[PDB]
Ligand SMILES: O=P(O)(O)OC[C@@H]1O[C@H](COP(=O)(O)O)[C@@H](OP(=O)(O)O)[C@H](OP(=O)(O)O)[C@H]1O
Ligand SMILES: Nc1ncnc2c1ncn2[C@@H]1O[C@H](COP(=O)(O)OP(=O)(O)O)[C@@H](O)[C@H]1O
């Protein structure tokens with residue numbers, strides 16, 4: 001019905017207009033959504049209607065992706081082998097901002113993960129934290145990870161930081177679709193069509209797509225949709241340069257592994273469909 005309905009039961013605010021939602025405007029994300037409305041990927045992303053001012057602040061006016069659904073179930077998949085910009089690596093070398101928050105979350109999961117010096121600092125750099133998160137989740141090996149589920153019963157979970165193996169990921173999707181063969185078939189048809197759109201997209205070949213998600217939405221009526229969201233760290237390649245989006249990331253090459261992730265994700269859902 002609406003995301004803000006769920007929020008009621010961060011960067012998001014209720015829109016006055018029916019079927020819309022407001023997201024705090026960021027310069028890279030605004031640039032991206034404007035381009036995407038004219039791209040092959042137009043139908044694979046939420047409609048972007050422009051910017052509005054609320055309480056002296058700028059908001060993206062977006063399609064509420066939950067609007068067409070009756071009690072939506074939602075799963076957010078973070079796409080890519082890398083979840084931070086290469087510029088974070090330069091910043092942490094020349095002028096590191098030590099992060100005490102990130103030390104704590106790391107310590108909780110693996111007490112032996114932090115180095116002697118990180119333990120002494122009670123702090124880690126952002127790229128160290130984000131690379132560690134990639135390796136204990138499925139990000140590094142499979143090129144995506146499950147971040148969160150919101151269920152029709154009102155329940156939500158973010159308990160997926162150690163969801164890493166192909167079979168662990170399959171079991172989360174298995175629980176998410178609750179044996180609805182029609183929802184799974186529709187998800188797979190939509191992911192196949194998104195992959196085809198990404199492989200021909202002018203936007204996609206010319207942009208490093210970091211920190212974006214695939215939002216899976218379904219309901220008890222067997223309606224099922226998937227969209228790309230979150231273009232806050234999606235940046236153009238300089239001087240008409242392109243990515244293949246499959247080859248491994250090496251600092252300098254700006255590769256995101258986006259399609260390595262999507263390939264693996266389709267493979268897992270195709271496997272689940274045959275179980
Ligand atoms: O390991 P988790 O607790 O699941 O998530 C860690 C956070 O991940 C964010 C992205 O992931 P998201 O798009 O929010 O899923 C980071 O944001 P940006 O990349 O937009 O800057 C945020 O960074 P910072 O604002 O510097 O603290 C991290 O602290
Ligand atoms: N257009 C949308 N319609 C409905 N829900 C949305 C929409 N965009 C984002 N969301 C919800 O908000 C969550 C966070 O979105 P995201 O764009 O990643 O924001 P952030 O930049 O704060 O991480 C998603 O996982 C989803 O539940």
Ligand SMILES: [Mn+2]
Nearest residue numbers: 211212213230
């Ligand atoms: Mn996000």
Ligand SMILES: [Mn+2]
Nearest residue numbers: 011211230232
């Ligand atoms: Mn965020």
Ligand SMILES: [Mn+2]
Nearest residue numbers: 230231232233
């Ligand atoms: Mn963002």
